[PDB]
Amino acid sequence: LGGYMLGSAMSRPIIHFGSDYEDRYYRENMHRYPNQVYYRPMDEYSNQNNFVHDCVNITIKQHTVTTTTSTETDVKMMERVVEQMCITQYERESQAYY
Amino acid sequence: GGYMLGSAMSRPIIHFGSDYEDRYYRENMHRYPNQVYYRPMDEYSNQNNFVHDCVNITIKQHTVNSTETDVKMMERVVEQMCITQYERESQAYY
């Protein structure tokens, strides 16, 4: 089922979009998204695919909860940056894990 | 010219926050290109212009009915393959 770790903060990924609007939007608003991701701890069943899959799901789900205090563009930006950060987190965990 | 066509690369498995899109990608990823067009590396080359160039040329080249979902998937596949191609070409330029 569940149980997720929260990774340490990281620099927000710079991401380039074909849409001039999205490209500029991300540059001006990347501060609005998290700089940490939730993930399922590295074990014997982990691999990049399933680690990033879970991290992306959990992190986005948790973020929806947390910000109970759209837009479609924001959902799109959020998923791109979370996925990139989740890959970075996989590199962290898999290397620490050896 | 003056763009290059990169060699085929393994299709990335790309993750979406939407359960529908995430699964749609898994089932249909074979429908999108596994090569991108790009401007070869030089002393003026940075991730910024390299990625933007690659995305602009690749998406048009492709632009010559498909669903809004496939258009979305294709644009994202290209945006993420152009990053990979930059990394590939970066190392090559050393």
Swiss-Prot record, chain B:
Effect of residue 58 to A: In SENF and early-onset dementia; induces loss of glycosylation at N-56
Glycosylation sites per record: 56, 65
Effect of residue 46 to S: In schizoaffective disorder
Outcome of swapping residue 63 to K: In early-onset dementia and dementia due to prion diseases
Intracellular or extracellular location(s): Cell membrane; Golgi apparatus
PTM info: The glycosylation pattern (the amount of mono-, di- and non-glycosylated forms or glycoforms) seems to differ in normal and CJD prion.
Disulfide bond annotation, renumbered to this chain: 54-82
Subunit structure: Monomer and homodimer. Has a tendency to aggregate into amyloid fibrils containing a cross-beta spine, formed by a steric zipper of superposed beta-strands. Soluble oligomers may represent an intermediate stage on the path to fibril formation. Copper binding may promote oligomerization. Interacts with GRB2, APP, ERI3/PRNPIP and SYN1. Mislocalized cytosolically exposed PrP interacts with MGRN1; this interaction alters MGRN1 subcellular location and causes lysosomal enlargement. Interacts with KIAA1191. Interacts with ADGRG6.
Domain writeup: The normal, monomeric form, PRPN(C), has a mainly alpha-helical structure. Misfolding of this form produces a disease-associated, protease-resistant form, PRPN (Sc), accompanied by a large increase of the beta-sheet content and formation of amyloid fibrils. These fibrils consist of a cross-beta spine, formed by a steric zipper of superposed beta-strands. Disease mutations may favor intermolecular contacts via short beta strands, and may thereby trigger oligomerization.
Function summary: Its primary physiological function is unclear. May play a role in neuronal development and synaptic plasticity. May be required for neuronal myelin sheath maintenance. May promote myelin homeostasis through acting as an agonist for ADGRG6 receptor. May play a role in iron uptake and iron homeostasis. Soluble oligomers are toxic to cultured neuroblastoma cells and induce apoptosis (in vitro). Association with GPC1 (via its heparan sulfate chains) targets PRNP to lipid rafts. Also provides Cu(2+) or Zn(2+) for the ascorbate-mediated GPC1 deaminase degradation of its heparan sulfate side chains.
Note: This protein is produced by a bicistronic gene which also produces the alternative prion protein/AltPrP (AC F7VJQ1) from an overlapping reading frame.
Disease listed for this protein: PrP is found in high quantity in the brain of humans and animals infected with neurodegenerative diseases known as transmissible spongiform encephalopathies or prion diseases, like: Creutzfeldt-Jakob disease (CJD), fatal familial insomnia (FFI), Gerstmann-Straussler disease (GSD), Huntington disease-like type 1 (HDL1) and kuru in humans; scrapie in sheep and goat; bovine spongiform encephalopathy (BSE) in cattle; transmissible mink encephalopathy (TME); chronic wasting disease (CWD) of mule deer and elk; feline spongiform encephalopathy (FSE) in cats and exotic ungulate encephalopathy (EUE) in nyala and greater kudu.
Family classification: Belongs to the prion family.
Name listed for the protein in its UniProt record: Major prion protein
Native organism: Homo sapiens (Human)
Gene: PRNP
